[PDB]
């Protein structure tokens, strides 16, 4: 039975830590982007481009985590 | 005398309770169940230290002169102006109560804490052998019941002043409407501000209790565990730090008392 | 640790030391200190007034 | 509204009351509304936007200075 | 009974960690938004729009975690 | 039995981590709010609006966590 | 039996986390308060009002945790 | 028996988390107080007054936690 | 036999921690990248090179961790 | 009698969390003290006074934790 | 079970904590690298040389845990 | 354990603590009191000079 | 079997947390020291004398935990 | 058999915590070193000397933890 039960916890930890990492990293990076926007409002279309360029790197691993969590919760269950 | 170090440390954490059902001394091995069992050692040392404070201050308040003050009068007036300035800095009302209350709090708590410095087993030894009493511990502030006693007194003052200086109407408004400011959030607002009101006196009492209890408990440990020839090198570096602690833990009590009473009315 | 009736006995000792202090201890000591302060303040004030 | 003075070493360049201004401060664009906390900063060369009371905008060109 | 007693802890880890991550990330981002808005009251709506844009990125993974924690807690029971 | 006492442990984990989040994030936000108020003391009423705007989304998740803690605790 | 031993542990974890949260949140908020007073101390009476206005919300939830921890320790026992 | 083992651990967790919270909160607040005192000497007394105003609020929940951990240690176990 | 679940648990831990680190370190570094780019908006082609130069180092150990987590999950388990 | 090993663990956790709290609080505080000295090197003997005044509070809870952990580890165990 | 599964958990802990440390330390360090490179766009070679000098020391002690976790997984288990 | 040895070690440590106190904690207090009487005498001296 | 083992686990947790505490605290303290040295290098011999004083307090409490971890491992075995 | 198989986990815990502590401490220290080197580039050989001075103190506690973790793994288990 435990082969069924524990897996929901093993995905629980994965999708908790993924959420903390992604939320905190994007919060920091977006905060710096916002302070840059407030000072150089004209550069907004440039800083936004660079912000999106960089965000895909922080979002890289957390989505491995979240997809493996969904798999384990539904695929192997 | 078969004191195992784990048992000697035990006896030191025993109060000298007297039972009020029969006015009898509660022995350490069996603790009777009841709420009616006064801790006698501490209440004595507490009333005695308050008496010593008041006598010292009165034998000068009845004589203080406006010339060049004596070397002893000067020491008292120093602390008088210190507490008076701490009050004036954090209170502007006309109440005559606040200044003497803070003076008594500061000096009395300071003296009670001062007991912590003495050799742990001096007075307990004299109390067992010379007099015959079963147990004694001589730090009043290292006991729960006194500290929260003062906290509940100051709490009753918080309520008295909160009612007097802004009336039941403003008091009920503050309790309910804040912090979310909408009448939709009143139900929750009462819990938060209600306990947060309760948090002040409880935390006041426990700030003093925990520090004094666990600063005493060290001397009981250093005394019991280490051999006599090694005790000093860990004892004195602890007392040199508790000399700072005993002062800060009375000054903070005075200051927070002043603050809770002044922020309640204004 | 263990709560006790002592929390009640100590509330008697506390209140009583606050009243005797409030009445006898504090008022006279502050009276004497202010009596010194006023004298030096106003004496020097008289001194600078006559100088001009 | 508050009182703004723009003064050179040689001549006074502006005066009067103002609703707000926008300066390109040294560390980045900046905007001073009334009651602003005491601040001191260098400003980069460029235009300074004024909106005189009753909303009358005007631009002054400042080669630089200390605000 | 023996089975269900652990799925509520599996939900608990997910949602505690997701609440921490989302709360702190949005706290940082909103703090930077308020700083930039306190420099320039005139850009407040533009900074608000950029804030809401980035904030959608902020709480995506946290909200996947919230959905799956609610699922486990009310659908797997 | 062993069933119920673990429910309270999970409820405690939920309602403690929610407290951590909702305290630290609103502290980080209110610190900036306060310095901005000290900077533009006239715009205080204007900035407090945005402060609540963002406070709501900050509290978003901790409140779901709290409701599920209360559910697990009392409703099962 | 095991019930009280585990319930004390649940209350312990709940109040511990509550204390960490409330203490650090009010610590940050107060640090900002003190810096803003240090720059100009005549706004002490005003910053010290906004400070309580915000601390009331900072310590909202932590006292929900304390409130239930005390309940579990003294009411459920 | 089984009681004291777990009860001591519960008190231990409680007071460890209390120690983390109070120490970090006071560290931040005192750091800001010392930077303010270095910035503007001759205001040390007023800033110290305010510092104690805040420190009194910081340590509340940690001190309830310390008190109840000692209660558990020396009253229940 | 029951052993197989602890391998998934171990990979969950390993990859979650690797995700936490790989997210937050790059979050900081990119926040500073943007802060530097807002200052000297013409040095983006240079700062953006130095950024990858350093970012190569940040994610390495997280990448080792992620690969070993994947191996443990699919190959071993 | 299994009792003892668990008590050793309960003391270890108390002293470890106390060590973390009392180390990081005083580190943050001493960092501000030192930066304050660097500015006003002649005021050092006054900021040492204020620093020792405040540090007596940072070590309030951590030293109680150390005491009770050292107690449980020896007196009880 | 107990033999092989736990060793994978020990490696998981080792190479997750090593990931946390080796990621966040280099993120912090590279943030200042990129700030210096934004203040002094001529020094970039000198500052990157210093960055590698220090980064070797930063990453060194995580790598002990990395190699040791690979050892534990493959050599031991 | 022998209890007399503990009472010996506590006495040793208390002697050492008193010897620290006398030479680091007491001199400051007497200095403060002496300096406040210096101040008060001067301030009375101020009023005497003012009468002159 | 498991009596002597777990003592090593308690020593491990104790020394691990002590290491984190001392490491992070002296890291922050020495960071502020280096900043003060950079701003006024001719003042270094004094800031170092104050740094050692503070550092003595910082690590002081992690080091009795270090001593007790060594005690638990070797002395208690 | 579980006895030493868990000693492997104990060393894992110990030296993983040591790893993160030393890594983050040196990261902060080096970040401040680089900022100093950026403010006074004529001064690098001195600030690096001081940095090496204090970096020995930072890791001192981490290094013995590493020694003891390695010992527990190879010598004991």
Numbering used by the authors:
A (entry chain N), E (entry chain S), G (entry chain M), H (entry chain J), I (entry chain O), J (entry chain L), ...: 3 to 79
B (entry chain a): 4 to 269
C (entry chain X), L (entry chain Y): 1 to 52
D (entry chain H): 3 to 69
F (entry chain R): 3 to 78
Sentences copied from the publication:
A key component in the generation of cellular metabolic energy is the F1Fo ATP synthase, a biological rotary motor that converts the proton motive force (pmf) to adenosine tri-phosphate (ATP) in both oxidative phosphorylation and photophosphorylation. The enzyme is comprised of two rotary motors, termed F1 and Fo, that are coupled together by two stalks: a central “rotor” stalk and a peripheral “stator” stalk. The Fo motor spans the membrane and converts the potential energy from the pmf into mechanical rotation of the central rotor that, in turn, drives conformational changes in the catalytic F1 motor subunits to generate ATP from ADP and inorganic phosphate (Pi). Here we have used cryo-Electron Microscopy (cryo-EM) on detergent-solubilized cysteine free E. coli ATP synthase13 to probe its structure and understand its rotational dynamics and coupling.
Focused classification of rotational State 1 highlighted five sub-classes, here termed Sub-states 1A, 1B, 1C, 1D, and 1E; with resolutions of 3.1, 3.3, 3.1, 3.2, and 3.3 Å, respectively. The defining theme of these sub-states was flexing of the central and peripheral stalks, with the majority of the flexibility seen in the peripheral stalk which bends and twists, together with minor movements within the central stalk. Independently, the movements seen between Sub-states 1B-E do not facilitate rotation of the c10 ring and instead illustrate torsional flexing of the entire complex. Sub-state 1A was in one rotational sub-state (here termed Sub-state 1’), whereas Sub-states 1B-E were rotated by a single c subunit relative to Sub-state 1’ (here termed Sub-state 1”). In State 1 the un-stretched spring corresponds to an Fo rotation angle in-between two of its 10 preferred rotational sub-states. The maps presented here were generated from material imaged in the presence of 10 mM MgADP and all showed the enzyme in the “autoinhibited” state, with the C-terminal domain of the ε subunit (εCTD) in the “up” inhibited position interacting with the F1 catalytic subunits. In the cryo-EM maps of the intact F1Fo enzyme in the presence of 10 mM MgADP, all α subunits contained ATP and Mg2+, whereas the contents of the β subunits varied: β1 bound ADP, Mg2+ and Pi, β2 bound only ADP, and β3 bound ADP and Mg2+.
